[PDB]
Structures are given as structure tokens and as C-alpha cells.
Design a protein around this ligand. Structure first.
Ligand code: HEM
Ligand SMILES: [O]
Length: 153
């Protein structure tokens, strides 16, 4: 649904994330947990972290951020052909972690906020539009996989 040109913008900005995976991971999760504190209760391994300082001091959270962004980066680089990458993710998030689709909108907001926060120059109107479209397709496809697993999250 994205043009080849929009995908180049998504991957261009993604390389900036890859220059600091762990720092982007942290900032996205702190944003997620600070703005949507109910998501913290679904991150049972992190729910004891109540302050942004406790969160930034958690090397465990920092590691998880790398795991999330690494997985998300692999999806974005497939330019929409991510069936195989989304399958394990939908399986675990729908059946094991029980993360609703709405929480994916929340982390999507957080990703975009952090990207603009760190790269206001490269992440302009067009890049934001493309990244929003890419994250939108990601949630759309993963919601379809949720239903196929019988969980509508
Ligand atoms: C872009 C969106 C997301 C991506 C790419 C992502 C990716 C991952 C990956 C790769 C794992 C480890 C393997 C697995 O169990 O599937 C994981 C674990 C997990 N994710 Fe997600 N995730 C996303 C969003 C979320 C959100 C919004 C939550 C809400 C709290 C969440 C909750 C969890 C939990 C609870 C685990 C298990 C961690 C543990 O207890 O060790 N995920 N995620
Ligand atoms: O995650």
C-alpha cells in the first residue's frame, strides 16, 4: 500500500534507529509506559518499573527494546512482504502475552514520537507519513493474524 518511494523513507529513518538500537528501544518503551500505564501491566517482567529513571536504569528493559526494534526492523525491511515475520509475533502476542491490538497503536505512537524526537530533521512530514503508513500496515496485517488464531485482541 506504500510506494517504493515511501519505503525508502521508512528504511532511511530506520538506519538511524539502527545506529542506536538500545537507546531508541528504551525511549520508545518509556514513552509507551509513561503515556499508557495500563500497558505496563501487560509487560509483567517490567511492571515493577514505576519511574522513568527506574526504567532507563533497567538493562533488562534496554535488552527487550533491542529485541522489539530488531524484530520490527526485519518487518519494515520486507516492505510489506512480512507474512513470515508477523506469524511468530502474532502467535506470541495474541496467545501468550495477550497484548491487544490497541497496544500496538500505542507503541506505534511511541515509535513515531521517539523518531521525531531524535531525528527532527530527517523525520519530516514525508518520512512521518511513510512511517505511519508502514506501522499502520503492520497493525492491519497483525490484526488479521490475531483473528486467524481466534483471538481478536
Ligand atoms: C512493534 C510492536 C512489537 C514488536 C515488534 C514486539 C516484539 C517482541 C518480540 C520479538 C518479543 C520476544 C519474542 C516473543 O515472545 O514474541 C516480544 C516479547 C514480549 N512482548 Fe512484544 N513486541 C511489540 C509490542 C508489544 C507491546 C506493545 C507490548 C505491551 C506491553 C508487548 C509485550 C510483550 C511481552 C509481555 C513479551 C514477553 C517478554 C518477556 O516476558 O520476556 N509487546 N515482543
Ligand atoms: O515486546
Amino acid at each position: 500500500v506504500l510506494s517504493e518511494g515511501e519505503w525508502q523513507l521508512v528504511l532511511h529513518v530506520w538506519a538511524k534507529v539502527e545506529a542506536d538500537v538500545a537507546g531508541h528501544g528504551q525511549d520508545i518503551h518509556i514513552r509507551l509506559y509513561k503515556s499508557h500505564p495500563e500497558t505496563l501491566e501487560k509487560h509483567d517482567r517490567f511492571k515493577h518499573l514505576k519511574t522513568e529513571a527506574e526504567m532507563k536504569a533497567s538493562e533488562d528493559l534496554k535488552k527487550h527494546g533491542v529485541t522489539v526494534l530488531t524484530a520490527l526492523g526485519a518487518i519494515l525491511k520486507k516492505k510489506g512482504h512480512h507474512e513470515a515475520e508477523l506469524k511468530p509475533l502474532a502467535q506470541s502476542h495474541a496467545t501468550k502475552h495477550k497484548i491487544p491490538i490497541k497496544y500496538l497503536e500505542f507503541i506505534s505512537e511511541a515509535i513515531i514520537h521517539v523518531l521525531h524526537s531524535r531525528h527532527p530533521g530527517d523525520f519530516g512530514a514525508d518520512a512521518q507519513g511513510a512511517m505511519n503508513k508502514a506501522l499502520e500496515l503492520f497493525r492491519k496485517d497483525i490484526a488479521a493474524k490475531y483473528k486467524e488464531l481466534g483471538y481478536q485482541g
